[PDB]
Amino acid sequence: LNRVFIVDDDTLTCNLLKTIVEPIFGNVEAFQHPRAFLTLSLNKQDIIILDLMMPDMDGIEVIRHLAEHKSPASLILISGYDSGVLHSAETLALSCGLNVINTFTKPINTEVLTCFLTSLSNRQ
Amino acid sequence: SLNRVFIVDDDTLTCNLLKTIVEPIFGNVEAFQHPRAFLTLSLNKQDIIILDLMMPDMDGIEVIRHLAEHKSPASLILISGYDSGVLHSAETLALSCGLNVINTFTKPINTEVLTCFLTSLSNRQ
Amino acid sequence: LNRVFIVDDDTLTCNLLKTIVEPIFGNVEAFQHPRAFLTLSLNKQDIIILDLMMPDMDGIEVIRHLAEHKSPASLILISGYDSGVLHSAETLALSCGLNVINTFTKPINTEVLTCFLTSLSNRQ
Amino acid sequence: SLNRVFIVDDDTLTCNLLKTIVEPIFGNVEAFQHPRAFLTLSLNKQDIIILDLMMPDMDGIEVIRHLAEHKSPASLILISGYDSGVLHSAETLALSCGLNVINTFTKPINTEVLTCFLTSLSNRQ
């Protein structure tokens, strides 16, 4: 894994995630417009951090898009809207064959996300 | 009753099975093997939609997303494998988006339970 | 399946369930004290309708008891407290090897429960 | 730090593994292979409990039930297979009963992630 995309229309969340991610994965990019992110072809070395964006469901469209195109990228779902809903999206996305490797509720637990991202990197 | 029932399922066999169970009870039943064609329709409060989730594709999820964005008032029934929570996940997602999910059924379908449910549904119209 | 037990400290729920159940399974008994129900040895032909009884968790104790004793009975969980919690209890109880055949949120959907119980009976 | 850590897991091997990961970081660590003995203890706000769910028995669920009934103030970490939602179910149950679940870990355990987490946990004491 060598690149991270952050997909969230919340500017302050995108900044926070960039700051946590960049020391670990230097190649990180945030999108606040999912439509722009959906023009990229991703590969197996990409990690996507995706907010579900409820109750508008732009995140649900992103998951449908990635499933339709059989994306090989690793996916982390986040949401502050409702955790039963977050866990449902994870279940649905896995069952459609996407590689969801984790989920986090907002407000984000930054220590847990830090440990988890470190372990995905190739440090010793 | 005479409510419209729309069956949405791209599998011809399970689609036809649903149709044979519904038609003696709700004669105005129409089956769509192509979800996107179904999505051009605008539905009423009295319409009943039987939606196969069509796992492991995301076509069922797209119909839910479309229905929720247009705030469909129609009653919704979801069908799929129990699948360690897949049907419950879709139901939770759909209820959360403001959709009126009135029941779910695991596949393969218990036709006795479905016949019994649609019968009571008809009688309370 | 030939006997139904209803386990719920809510008297009005117990009455409602008895009235729905008895036309279908004549041998039905309700307990408002779980401790009394836990003195019975159940068999494979028993159906238990159990409220989780949150936030006190008497229902959780009933599930632990039935798991410890490897009860063969069929189990239906109900709760008006929180449906993510209801679905968690179902998941936990199945994974401990109990035969959970359904769950219902309160207020109970009486048409759905009626259809479901009918299908468990031996009518044609 | 010098918080007490209690490891509750009746499997001697996975128990010992947890213990070897915790002890360099929290020296005051005690492992219980018998949940009921652990349940005689009264815990403080600063205690950390690492609880194996011990599926497919219900011993982990009983510790959660006991802790919640006595309103334990201790921090709780839950360990188990992802198991199509089993760990998430226990976490949801425990949070709902008012317990302070600070993290969960799937088995088999990623010792790097656990070492990293307990290190930050120690540093924020």
Short mmCIF file of C-alpha atoms in Angstrom, two decimals:
data_model
loop_
_atom_site.label_atom_id
_atom_site.label_comp_id
_atom_site.label_asym_id
_atom_site.label_seq_id
_atom_site.Cartn_x
_atom_site.Cartn_y
_atom_site.Cartn_z
CA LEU A 1 0.00 0.00 0.00
CA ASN A 2 1.55 3.35 -1.11
CA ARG A 3 -1.09 6.05 -1.71
CA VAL A 4 -4.02 7.38 0.33
CA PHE A 5 -7.12 9.14 -0.87
CA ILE A 6 -9.40 10.97 1.55
CA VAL A 7 -12.98 11.43 0.36
CA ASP A 8 -15.12 13.73 2.57
CA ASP A 9 -16.91 17.02 1.92
CA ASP A 10 -16.03 18.25 5.39
CA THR A 11 -13.00 20.48 4.97
CA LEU A 12 -11.88 20.27 8.61
CA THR A 13 -12.01 16.42 8.58
CA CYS A 14 -10.03 16.28 5.34
CA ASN A 15 -7.31 18.49 6.93
CA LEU A 16 -7.19 16.49 10.10
CA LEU A 17 -6.87 13.19 8.16
CA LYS A 18 -4.19 14.64 5.88
CA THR A 19 -2.12 15.64 8.91
CA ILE A 20 -2.36 12.18 10.48
CA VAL A 21 -1.80 10.34 7.20
CA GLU A 22 1.10 12.30 5.62
CA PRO A 23 3.80 11.34 8.13
CA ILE A 24 3.00 7.71 7.34
CA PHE A 25 2.12 7.79 3.64
CA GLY A 26 3.65 10.82 1.93
CA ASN A 27 1.50 10.40 -1.14
CA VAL A 28 -1.91 11.50 0.14
CA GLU A 29 -4.64 13.51 -1.58
CA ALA A 30 -8.03 14.70 -0.29
CA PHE A 31 -11.18 15.28 -2.38
CA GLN A 32 -14.20 17.18 -1.16
CA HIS A 33 -16.04 16.44 -4.40
CA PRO A 34 -16.67 12.69 -4.80
CA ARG A 35 -17.52 13.15 -8.44
CA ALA A 36 -13.90 14.17 -9.04
CA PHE A 37 -12.55 11.17 -7.16
CA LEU A 38 -14.76 8.84 -9.25
CA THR A 39 -12.86 9.83 -12.42
CA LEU A 40 -9.69 8.07 -11.14
CA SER A 41 -8.80 4.45 -11.79
CA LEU A 42 -7.42 3.09 -8.57
CA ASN A 43 -5.18 0.13 -8.01
CA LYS A 44 -4.37 -2.39 -5.33
CA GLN A 45 -1.85 -0.15 -3.62
CA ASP A 46 -4.41 2.59 -2.92
CA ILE A 47 -6.13 3.11 0.40
CA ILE A 48 -9.33 5.06 0.39
CA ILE A 49 -10.66 6.80 3.45
CA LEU A 50 -14.27 7.50 2.67
CA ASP A 51 -16.95 9.29 4.66
CA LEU A 52 -20.41 7.92 3.96
CA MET A 53 -21.67 11.54 3.81
CA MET A 54 -25.12 10.81 5.36
CA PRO A 55 -27.91 11.66 5.05
CA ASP A 56 -27.18 12.72 1.45
CA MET A 57 -25.60 9.36 0.55
CA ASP A 58 -22.76 10.58 -1.74
CA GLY A 59 -20.66 7.96 0.11
CA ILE A 60 -23.17 5.25 -0.83
CA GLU A 61 -22.78 6.28 -4.53
CA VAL A 62 -18.98 6.05 -4.14
CA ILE A 63 -19.27 2.49 -2.78
CA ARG A 64 -21.66 1.51 -5.67
CA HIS A 65 -19.22 3.00 -8.20
CA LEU A 66 -16.21 1.14 -6.71
CA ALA A 67 -18.19 -2.11 -6.64
CA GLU A 68 -19.38 -1.72 -10.27
CA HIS A 69 -15.76 -1.26 -11.38
CA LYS A 70 -14.39 -4.02 -9.18
CA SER A 71 -11.87 -1.63 -7.51
CA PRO A 72 -8.96 -3.50 -5.89
CA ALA A 73 -8.21 -0.56 -3.52
CA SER A 74 -8.40 -0.93 0.31
CA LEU A 75 -11.23 0.91 1.93
CA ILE A 76 -11.79 2.55 5.26
CA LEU A 77 -15.26 3.85 6.00
CA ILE A 78 -15.94 6.63 8.40
CA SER A 79 -19.09 8.40 9.58
CA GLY A 80 -20.39 10.54 12.48
CA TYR A 81 -24.00 10.04 11.45
CA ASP A 82 -24.94 6.65 12.99
CA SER A 83 -22.85 3.67 13.83
CA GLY A 84 -25.43 1.00 13.03
CA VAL A 85 -25.53 2.65 9.57
CA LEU A 86 -21.72 2.67 9.38
CA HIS A 87 -21.56 -1.04 10.21
CA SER A 88 -24.33 -1.79 7.64
CA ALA A 89 -22.32 0.00 4.87
CA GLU A 90 -19.25 -2.03 5.79
CA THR A 91 -21.29 -5.25 5.63
CA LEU A 92 -22.82 -4.30 2.27
CA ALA A 93 -19.50 -3.21 0.77
CA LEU A 94 -17.71 -6.40 1.83
CA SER A 95 -20.51 -8.59 0.50
CA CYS A 96 -20.21 -6.79 -2.86
CA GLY A 97 -16.58 -7.86 -2.82
CA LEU A 98 -14.83 -4.58 -1.86
CA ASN A 99 -11.82 -4.80 0.44
CA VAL A 100 -13.05 -2.86 3.49
CA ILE A 101 -10.21 -3.11 6.02
CA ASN A 102 -11.71 -0.90 8.78
CA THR A 103 -14.28 1.64 9.91
CA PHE A 104 -14.16 4.58 12.30
CA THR A 105 -16.93 6.67 13.87
CA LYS A 106 -16.49 10.50 14.09
CA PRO A 107 -15.24 12.16 16.14
CA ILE A 108 -12.27 10.12 14.88
CA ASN A 109 -10.12 8.25 17.35
CA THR A 110 -6.75 9.58 16.19
CA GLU A 111 -4.55 7.24 18.24
CA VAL A 112 -6.38 4.18 16.84
CA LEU A 113 -6.29 5.46 13.29
CA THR A 114 -2.55 6.29 13.69
CA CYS A 115 -1.68 2.79 14.94
CA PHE A 116 -3.74 1.18 12.23
CA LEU A 117 -2.25 3.21 9.37
CA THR A 118 1.30 2.58 10.65
CA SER A 119 0.69 -1.16 10.50
CA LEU A 120 -0.35 -0.89 6.80
CA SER A 121 2.90 0.82 5.97
CA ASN A 122 6.18 -0.91 5.28
CA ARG A 123 8.14 0.38 8.19
CA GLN A 124 9.86 -2.32 10.29
CA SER B 1 -55.97 -5.50 -3.35
CA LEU B 2 -55.51 -3.40 -6.51
CA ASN B 3 -52.25 -1.74 -5.37
CA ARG B 4 -49.52 -1.82 -7.96
CA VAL B 5 -46.74 -4.27 -6.97
CA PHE B 6 -43.36 -3.88 -8.70
CA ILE B 7 -41.00 -6.81 -8.60
CA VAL B 8 -37.36 -5.79 -9.17
CA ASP B 9 -34.99 -8.74 -9.63
CA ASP B 10 -32.67 -9.43 -12.54
CA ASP B 11 -32.78 -13.20 -11.98
CA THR B 12 -35.43 -14.59 -14.29
CA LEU B 13 -36.23 -17.68 -12.19
CA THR B 14 -36.58 -16.01 -8.74
CA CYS B 15 -38.36 -13.15 -10.45
CA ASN B 16 -40.97 -15.45 -12.01
CA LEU B 17 -41.40 -17.26 -8.69
CA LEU B 18 -42.21 -13.94 -6.91
CA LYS B 19 -44.57 -13.04 -9.70
CA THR B 20 -46.51 -16.30 -9.41
CA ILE B 21 -46.88 -15.78 -5.66
CA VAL B 22 -48.04 -12.16 -5.94
CA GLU B 23 -50.39 -12.29 -8.86
CA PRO B 24 -53.24 -14.29 -7.28
CA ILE B 25 -53.26 -11.73 -4.50
CA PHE B 26 -52.41 -8.41 -6.19
CA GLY B 27 -53.40 -8.73 -9.82
CA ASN B 28 -51.70 -5.47 -10.89
CA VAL B 29 -48.18 -6.79 -10.61
CA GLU B 30 -45.35 -5.94 -12.95
CA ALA B 31 -41.88 -7.47 -12.97
CA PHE B 32 -38.68 -5.60 -14.00
CA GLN B 33 -35.56 -7.58 -14.81
CA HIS B 34 -33.72 -4.29 -15.44
CA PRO B 35 -33.39 -2.08 -12.38
CA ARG B 36 -32.58 1.03 -14.33
CA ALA B 37 -35.77 0.81 -16.29
CA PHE B 38 -37.65 0.49 -13.04
CA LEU B 39 -35.93 3.65 -11.82
CA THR B 40 -37.58 5.82 -14.49
CA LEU B 41 -40.94 5.22 -12.80
CA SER B 42 -42.40 7.58 -10.22
CA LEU B 43 -44.13 5.74 -7.44
CA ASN B 44 -47.07 6.42 -5.17
CA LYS B 45 -47.70 5.99 -1.50
CA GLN B 46 -49.89 2.95 -2.30
CA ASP B 47 -47.32 1.18 -4.51
CA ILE B 48 -45.47 -1.87 -3.06
CA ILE B 49 -41.92 -2.61 -4.27
CA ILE B 50 -40.37 -6.05 -3.84
CA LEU B 51 -36.66 -5.52 -4.25
CA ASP B 52 -34.07 -8.31 -4.58
CA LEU B 53 -30.73 -6.95 -3.36
CA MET B 54 -29.07 -8.79 -6.24
CA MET B 55 -25.93 -9.54 -4.19
CA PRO B 56 -23.10 -9.69 -4.91
CA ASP B 57 -23.61 -6.78 -7.38
CA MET B 58 -24.63 -3.35 -6.10
CA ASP B 59 -27.80 -2.96 -8.21
CA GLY B 60 -30.11 -3.39 -5.17
CA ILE B 61 -28.18 -0.76 -3.25
CA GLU B 62 -28.50 1.65 -6.20
CA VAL B 63 -32.28 1.26 -6.28
CA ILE B 64 -32.37 2.04 -2.51
CA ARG B 65 -30.13 5.08 -3.03
CA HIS B 66 -32.30 6.30 -5.94
CA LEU B 67 -35.56 5.73 -4.03
CA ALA B 68 -34.24 7.58 -0.98
CA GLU B 69 -32.92 10.58 -2.97
CA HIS B 70 -36.33 11.02 -4.62
CA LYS B 71 -38.00 10.44 -1.25
CA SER B 72 -40.21 7.67 -2.62
CA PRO B 73 -43.30 7.16 -0.47
CA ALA B 74 -43.79 3.56 -1.68
CA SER B 75 -43.77 0.51 0.67
CA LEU B 76 -40.64 -1.54 0.28
CA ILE B 77 -39.94 -5.27 0.76
CA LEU B 78 -36.35 -6.46 0.56
CA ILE B 79 -35.24 -9.90 -0.43
CA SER B 80 -31.84 -11.59 -0.10
CA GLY B 81 -29.73 -14.18 1.80
CA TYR B 82 -29.52 -13.60 5.62
CA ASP B 83 -25.81 -13.68 4.85
CA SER B 84 -24.32 -12.85 8.24
CA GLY B 85 -26.26 -9.53 8.34
CA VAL B 86 -26.54 -8.47 4.64
CA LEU B 87 -30.34 -8.25 4.60
CA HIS B 88 -30.42 -6.53 8.00
CA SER B 89 -27.78 -4.03 6.74
CA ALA B 90 -29.88 -3.07 3.68
CA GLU B 91 -32.94 -2.75 5.83
CA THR B 92 -31.05 -0.52 8.32
CA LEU B 93 -29.61 1.60 5.52
CA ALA B 94 -33.03 1.97 3.85
CA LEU B 95 -34.90 2.84 7.05
CA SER B 96 -32.21 5.33 7.90
CA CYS B 97 -32.65 7.08 4.55
CA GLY B 98 -36.30 7.54 5.34
CA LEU B 99 -37.69 4.62 3.29
CA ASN B 100 -40.80 2.64 4.43
CA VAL B 101 -39.43 -0.95 4.64
CA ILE B 102 -42.42 -3.10 5.64
CA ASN B 103 -40.69 -6.50 5.68
CA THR B 104 -37.71 -8.52 4.53
CA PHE B 105 -37.34 -12.13 3.37
CA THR B 106 -34.32 -14.37 3.22
CA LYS B 107 -33.63 -16.44 0.20
CA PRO B 108 -34.43 -19.00 -0.71
CA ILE B 109 -37.86 -17.73 -0.15
CA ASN B 110 -40.41 -19.36 2.17
CA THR B 111 -43.37 -19.09 -0.17
CA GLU B 112 -45.85 -19.97 2.59
CA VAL B 113 -44.70 -16.99 4.73
CA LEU B 114 -44.67 -14.63 1.72
CA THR B 115 -48.19 -15.68 0.61
CA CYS B 116 -49.44 -15.27 4.16
CA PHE B 117 -47.83 -11.79 4.50
CA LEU B 118 -49.13 -10.44 1.17
CA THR B 119 -52.58 -11.78 2.07
CA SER B 120 -52.65 -9.78 5.33
CA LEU B 121 -51.15 -6.78 3.47
CA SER B 122 -54.02 -6.92 0.99
CA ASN B 123 -56.66 -7.28 3.70
CA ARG B 124 -55.39 -4.18 5.52
CA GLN B 125 -55.68 -1.98 2.39
CA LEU C 1 -42.22 -27.43 17.35
CA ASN C 2 -45.11 -27.82 19.87
CA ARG C 3 -44.75 -25.49 22.88
CA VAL C 4 -44.12 -21.76 23.26
CA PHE C 5 -42.65 -19.91 26.18
CA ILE C 6 -42.91 -16.12 26.45
CA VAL C 7 -40.29 -14.47 28.65
CA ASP C 8 -40.89 -10.74 29.32
CA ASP C 9 -41.49 -8.75 32.51
CA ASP C 10 -43.94 -6.50 30.70
CA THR C 11 -47.39 -7.81 31.55
CA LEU C 12 -49.15 -6.18 28.60
CA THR C 13 -46.63 -7.63 26.09
CA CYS C 14 -46.97 -11.11 27.60
CA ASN C 15 -50.78 -10.89 27.18
CA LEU C 16 -50.57 -9.64 23.64
CA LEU C 17 -48.12 -12.44 22.67
CA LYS C 18 -50.26 -15.08 24.38
CA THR C 19 -53.29 -13.98 22.35
CA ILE C 20 -51.40 -14.14 19.04
CA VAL C 21 -49.64 -17.41 19.89
CA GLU C 22 -52.48 -19.52 21.39
CA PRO C 23 -54.56 -19.93 18.23
CA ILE C 24 -51.45 -21.39 16.58
CA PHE C 25 -49.75 -23.26 19.42
CA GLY C 26 -52.25 -24.18 22.15
CA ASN C 27 -49.52 -25.03 24.61
CA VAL C 28 -48.17 -21.59 25.50
CA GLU C 29 -46.97 -20.22 28.84
CA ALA C 30 -45.70 -16.75 29.78
CA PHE C 31 -43.18 -15.92 32.54
CA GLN C 32 -42.59 -12.45 33.89
CA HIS C 33 -39.84 -13.74 36.15
CA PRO C 34 -36.90 -15.09 34.12
CA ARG C 35 -35.48 -16.80 37.17
CA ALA C 36 -38.52 -19.08 37.16
CA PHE C 37 -38.16 -19.87 33.47
CA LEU C 38 -34.48 -20.78 34.00
CA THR C 39 -35.50 -23.71 36.25
CA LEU C 40 -37.04 -25.55 33.25
CA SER C 41 -35.19 -27.98 31.00
CA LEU C 42 -36.29 -27.24 27.48
CA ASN C 43 -36.19 -29.45 24.45
CA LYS C 44 -35.99 -29.17 20.70
CA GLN C 45 -39.71 -28.74 20.27
CA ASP C 46 -39.83 -25.57 22.40
CA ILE C 47 -39.93 -22.07 21.00
CA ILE C 48 -38.88 -19.27 23.28
CA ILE C 49 -39.96 -15.71 22.76
CA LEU C 50 -37.58 -13.67 24.85
CA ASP C 51 -37.41 -9.95 25.50
CA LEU C 52 -33.86 -8.77 26.10
CA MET C 53 -35.20 -6.64 29.00
CA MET C 54 -32.75 -3.71 28.51
CA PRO C 55 -31.20 -1.82 30.12
CA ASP C 56 -31.30 -4.27 33.06
CA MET C 57 -30.03 -7.19 30.95
CA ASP C 58 -32.14 -10.03 32.47
CA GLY C 59 -32.54 -11.16 28.83
CA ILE C 60 -28.75 -11.28 28.42
CA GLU C 61 -28.57 -13.58 31.51
CA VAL C 62 -31.25 -15.81 29.94
CA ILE C 63 -29.21 -16.12 26.73
CA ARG C 64 -26.00 -16.92 28.76
CA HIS C 65 -27.92 -19.57 30.74
CA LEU C 66 -29.35 -21.21 27.58
CA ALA C 67 -25.90 -21.19 25.95
CA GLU C 68 -24.20 -22.71 29.05
CA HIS C 69 -26.74 -25.56 29.02
CA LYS C 70 -26.64 -26.05 25.27
CA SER C 71 -30.45 -25.58 24.96
CA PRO C 72 -31.84 -27.08 21.73
CA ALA C 73 -34.95 -24.80 21.85
CA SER C 74 -35.74 -22.28 19.05
CA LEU C 75 -35.36 -18.68 20.03
CA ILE C 76 -37.00 -15.46 19.03
CA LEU C 77 -35.58 -12.27 20.44
CA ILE C 78 -37.57 -9.14 20.86
CA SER C 79 -36.80 -5.65 22.20
CA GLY C 80 -38.10 -2.06 22.04
CA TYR C 81 -34.90 -0.66 23.50
CA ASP C 82 -32.55 -0.38 20.48
CA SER C 83 -32.41 -2.32 17.29
CA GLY C 84 -28.65 -2.27 16.83
CA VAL C 85 -28.57 -3.87 20.32
CA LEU C 86 -31.24 -6.40 19.30
CA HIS C 87 -29.27 -7.40 16.22
CA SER C 88 -26.04 -7.66 18.30
CA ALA C 89 -27.77 -10.08 20.78
CA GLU C 90 -28.96 -12.20 17.87
CA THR C 91 -25.41 -12.29 16.44
CA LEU C 92 -23.90 -13.19 19.83
CA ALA C 93 -26.51 -15.86 20.57
CA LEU C 94 -26.09 -17.54 17.18
CA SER C 95 -22.31 -17.52 17.48
CA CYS C 96 -22.64 -19.25 20.88
CA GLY C 97 -24.57 -21.93 19.04
CA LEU C 98 -28.18 -21.10 20.04
CA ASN C 99 -30.89 -21.56 17.42
CA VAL C 100 -32.16 -17.99 17.00
CA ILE C 101 -34.79 -18.19 14.26
CA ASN C 102 -35.95 -14.52 14.31
CA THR C 103 -36.06 -11.15 16.00
CA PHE C 104 -38.73 -8.47 16.31
CA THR C 105 -38.55 -4.84 17.47
CA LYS C 106 -41.35 -3.47 19.74
CA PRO C 107 -43.91 -2.23 19.08
CA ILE C 108 -44.36 -5.76 17.68
CA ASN C 109 -45.46 -6.20 14.09
CA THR C 110 -48.35 -8.58 14.76
CA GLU C 111 -49.07 -9.53 11.13
CA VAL C 112 -45.41 -10.52 10.60
CA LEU C 113 -45.20 -12.44 13.84
CA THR C 114 -48.51 -14.21 12.99
CA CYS C 115 -47.30 -15.30 9.54
CA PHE C 116 -44.00 -16.44 10.94
CA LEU C 117 -45.48 -18.49 13.78
CA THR C 118 -48.00 -20.13 11.42
CA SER C 119 -45.15 -21.32 9.22
CA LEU C 120 -43.46 -23.02 12.23
CA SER C 121 -46.62 -24.96 12.95
CA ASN C 122 -47.65 -28.17 11.27
CA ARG C 123 -50.75 -26.96 9.56
CA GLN C 124 -50.91 -27.71 5.81
CA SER D 1 2.21 3.54 32.88
CA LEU D 2 1.51 1.96 36.29
CA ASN D 3 -2.22 1.32 35.64
CA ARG D 4 -3.32 -2.16 36.52
CA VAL D 5 -4.06 -4.22 33.37
CA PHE D 6 -6.20 -7.37 33.79
CA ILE D 7 -6.06 -9.94 31.05
CA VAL D 8 -9.12 -12.22 31.02
CA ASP D 9 -8.82 -15.19 28.65
CA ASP D 10 -9.16 -18.87 29.48
CA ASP D 11 -6.86 -19.91 26.61
CA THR D 12 -3.40 -20.33 28.05
CA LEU D 13 -1.51 -19.64 24.80
CA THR D 14 -3.36 -16.46 23.68
CA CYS D 15 -3.38 -15.34 27.29
CA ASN D 16 0.40 -15.65 27.60
CA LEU D 17 0.85 -13.87 24.26
CA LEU D 18 -1.20 -10.87 25.51
CA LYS D 19 0.76 -10.88 28.73
CA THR D 20 4.11 -10.75 26.94
CA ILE D 21 2.92 -7.81 24.84
CA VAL D 22 1.55 -5.83 27.80
CA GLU D 23 4.18 -6.34 30.41
CA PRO D 24 7.01 -4.28 28.86
CA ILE D 25 4.56 -1.40 28.69
CA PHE D 26 2.37 -1.76 31.79
CA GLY D 27 4.37 -3.68 34.35
CA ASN D 28 1.42 -4.18 36.74
CA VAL D 29 -0.34 -6.74 34.61
CA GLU D 30 -2.19 -9.75 35.91
CA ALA D 31 -3.69 -12.56 33.85
CA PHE D 32 -6.84 -14.53 34.84
CA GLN D 33 -7.58 -17.83 33.13
CA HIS D 34 -10.78 -18.11 35.19
CA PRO D 35 -13.34 -15.40 34.49
CA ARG D 36 -15.29 -16.00 37.64
CA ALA D 37 -12.28 -15.37 39.79
CA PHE D 38 -11.72 -12.14 37.94
CA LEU D 39 -15.32 -11.17 38.69
CA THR D 40 -14.70 -11.05 42.45
CA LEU D 41 -12.44 -8.03 41.92
CA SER D 42 -13.67 -4.46 42.18
CA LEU D 43 -12.11 -2.24 39.58
CA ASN D 44 -11.13 1.40 39.38
CA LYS D 45 -11.51 4.08 36.78
CA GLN D 46 -7.79 3.73 35.96
CA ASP D 47 -7.84 -0.07 35.51
CA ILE D 48 -7.67 -1.47 31.93
CA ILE D 49 -9.36 -4.82 31.18
CA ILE D 50 -8.43 -6.86 28.13
CA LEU D 51 -11.29 -9.27 27.64
CA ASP D 52 -11.27 -12.23 25.23
CA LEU D 53 -14.88 -13.00 24.29
CA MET D 54 -14.03 -16.69 24.52
CA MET D 55 -16.43 -17.60 21.67
CA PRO D 56 -18.13 -19.93 21.20
CA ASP D 57 -18.86 -20.11 24.98
CA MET D 58 -20.68 -17.25 26.71
CA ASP D 59 -18.03 -16.50 29.37
CA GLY D 60 -17.03 -13.19 27.71
CA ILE D 61 -20.65 -12.09 27.57
CA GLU D 62 -21.05 -12.91 31.28
CA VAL D 63 -18.08 -10.72 32.22
CA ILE D 64 -19.65 -7.84 30.20
CA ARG D 65 -23.01 -8.41 31.91
CA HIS D 66 -21.36 -8.49 35.36
CA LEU D 67 -19.25 -5.38 34.67
CA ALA D 68 -22.28 -3.45 33.42
CA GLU D 69 -24.52 -4.43 36.37
CA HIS D 70 -21.87 -3.20 38.82
CA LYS D 71 -21.32 -0.13 36.64
CA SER D 72 -17.58 -0.74 36.40
CA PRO D 73 -15.71 2.45 35.53
CA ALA D 74 -12.71 0.53 34.10
CA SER D 75 -11.51 0.88 30.46
CA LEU D 76 -12.33 -2.17 28.41
CA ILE D 77 -10.61 -3.76 25.38
CA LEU D 78 -12.37 -6.63 23.64
CA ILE D 79 -10.69 -9.35 21.69
CA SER D 80 -12.15 -11.95 19.31
CA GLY D 81 -12.59 -13.04 15.65
CA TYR D 82 -14.26 -10.39 13.37
CA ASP D 83 -16.62 -13.28 12.73
CA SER D 84 -19.24 -11.64 10.52
CA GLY D 85 -19.98 -9.03 13.25
CA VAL D 86 -19.33 -10.90 16.56
CA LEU D 87 -16.74 -8.44 17.88
CA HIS D 88 -18.80 -5.45 16.74
CA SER D 89 -21.89 -6.97 18.46
CA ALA D 90 -20.07 -7.30 21.83
CA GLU D 91 -18.74 -3.81 21.50
CA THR D 92 -22.25 -2.46 20.72
CA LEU D 93 -23.77 -4.40 23.61
CA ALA D 94 -21.06 -3.21 26.02
CA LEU D 95 -21.24 0.45 24.99
CA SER D 96 -24.99 0.30 25.26
CA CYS D 97 -24.78 -0.97 28.84
CA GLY D 98 -22.69 2.05 29.71
CA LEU D 99 -19.24 0.41 29.58
CA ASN D 100 -16.11 2.35 28.43
CA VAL D 101 -14.89 0.21 25.47
CA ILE D 102 -11.70 1.91 24.26
CA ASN D 103 -10.79 -0.49 21.45
CA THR D 104 -11.30 -3.94 19.97
CA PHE D 105 -8.92 -6.37 18.25
CA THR D 106 -9.62 -9.27 15.94
CA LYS D 107 -7.89 -12.53 16.41
CA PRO D 108 -5.44 -13.64 15.57
CA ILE D 109 -3.96 -10.60 17.07
CA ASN D 110 -1.80 -8.08 15.17
CA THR D 111 0.84 -7.66 17.84
CA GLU D 112 2.33 -4.60 16.12
CA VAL D 113 -1.01 -2.73 16.30
CA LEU D 114 -1.62 -3.83 19.92
CA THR D 115 1.90 -2.75 21.04
CA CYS D 116 1.45 0.56 19.28
CA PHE D 117 -2.00 1.15 20.87
CA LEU D 118 -0.91 0.28 24.44
CA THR D 119 2.12 2.53 23.98
CA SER D 120 -0.08 5.54 23.11
CA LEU D 121 -2.48 4.54 25.92
CA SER D 122 0.40 4.64 28.39
CA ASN D 123 1.69 7.98 27.10
CA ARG D 124 -1.72 9.61 27.54
CA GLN D 125 -1.96 8.58 31.23
#
